[PDB]
Write an enzyme that holds these catalytic residues in place. Sequence first.
Site, PDB file in Angstrom:
ATOM      1  N   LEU A 107       0.856  -1.192   0.000  1.00  0.00           N
ATOM      2  CA  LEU A 107       0.000   0.000   0.000  1.00  0.00           C
ATOM      3  C   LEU A 107       0.892   1.242   0.000  1.00  0.00           C
ATOM      4  O   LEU A 107       1.729   1.387   0.900  1.00  0.00           O
ATOM      5  CB  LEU A 107      -0.893   0.032   1.250  1.00  0.00           C
ATOM      6  N   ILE A 138       4.592  -1.187   3.282  1.00  0.00           N
ATOM      7  CA  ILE A 138       4.256   0.192   2.949  1.00  0.00           C
ATOM      8  C   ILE A 138       5.137   0.618   1.775  1.00  0.00           C
ATOM      9  O   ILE A 138       6.367   0.447   1.815  1.00  0.00           O
ATOM     10  CB  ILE A 138       4.413   1.131   4.150  1.00  0.00           C
ATOM     11  N   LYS A 139       4.516   1.215   0.772  1.00  0.00           N
ATOM     12  CA  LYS A 139       5.183   1.557  -0.473  1.00  0.00           C
ATOM     13  C   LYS A 139       5.503   3.056  -0.484  1.00  0.00           C
ATOM     14  O   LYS A 139       4.602   3.908  -0.349  1.00  0.00           O
ATOM     15  CB  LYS A 139       4.310   1.078  -1.628  1.00  0.00           C
ATOM     16  N   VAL A 140       6.798   3.355  -0.639  1.00  0.00           N
ATOM     17  CA  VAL A 140       7.360   4.687  -0.442  1.00  0.00           C
ATOM     18  C   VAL A 140       8.201   5.039  -1.665  1.00  0.00           C
ATOM     19  O   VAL A 140       9.131   4.294  -1.998  1.00  0.00           O
ATOM     20  CB  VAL A 140       8.255   4.708   0.809  1.00  0.00           C
TER      21      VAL A 140
END
Length: 351
Positions: A107, A138-140
């Site tokens: 996400l 978590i997508k950064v």
Amino acid sequence: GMTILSDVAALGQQIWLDNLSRSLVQSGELAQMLKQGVCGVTSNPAIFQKAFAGDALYADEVAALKRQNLSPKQRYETMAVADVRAACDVCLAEHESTGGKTGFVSLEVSPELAKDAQGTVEEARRLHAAIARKNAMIKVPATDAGIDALETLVSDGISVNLTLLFSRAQTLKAYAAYARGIAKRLAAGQSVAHIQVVASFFISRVDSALDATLPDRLKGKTAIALAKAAYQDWEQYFTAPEFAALEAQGANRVQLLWASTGVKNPAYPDTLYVDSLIGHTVNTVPDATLKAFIDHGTAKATLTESADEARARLAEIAALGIDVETLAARLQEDGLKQFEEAFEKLLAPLV
């Protein structure tokens, strides 16, 4: 045929689905994929914009959320976190079967935070807690601020998908930040064996940017050459004594993940990127590319073949005056603009 997915797994590459929607999970389709050679899921704001616009199962959820005093962003997040939770639950058996090495769902944080390290950390910690699953990433975005945030998030024990990489130099900076975060945990006596990070290195957008002006012998070659060279860099970094000292203590290597692997030019076979990039890696594919690969893809260890040719091609790209580092920065900024555009488009119907 379908068994190509297991053939690729035996070559050491995970295939993930680059799509997510409420119906993909609710229908039972994701669970059936997870028993049959798909090993994870990625999302991004464009994927959610399309899902929210097209999937009938959101209508009742939106109507429910419009009865509450919530911002458009929190309506979106409630929807997206619910999908991610549900997908994580489907993927959990797979994830646990490998000791937490597979079966992830990603996400992405809001695009507006991309240059704000502190805000990125705050949102990533919050979304990690909201999803409340061990197999969520978590997508950064891999901006400089994102790499700052990566070190902090790794030191906090959070699994991360660092995205919008187009640069070998920026990828190496990400590995160094990861290693600093791991070293911090080991010095604090904290666990590291559960922390997983992928470096999502984009493929098709490089060829889309360059091909119309390249000489004939380079058209459709640059993105694959960059990926091959990136994988050589990865081998060198993670086998070196510095990282080996961490891996001996339980640290996991970062893994390269090939993204933007749908072919965008009909002059190239639709399985080009998947076929060409198989080697401790991941490839996340859109539905139609997964379809094509099952039908007529090839499972062979291609990623490390002919690295000399990849280097010679990158030397010619430089000879032509194409600076792949300048290009990478432009493509990252363009990708952030485009994800922000998609995000604003998905928020408007949630007002």
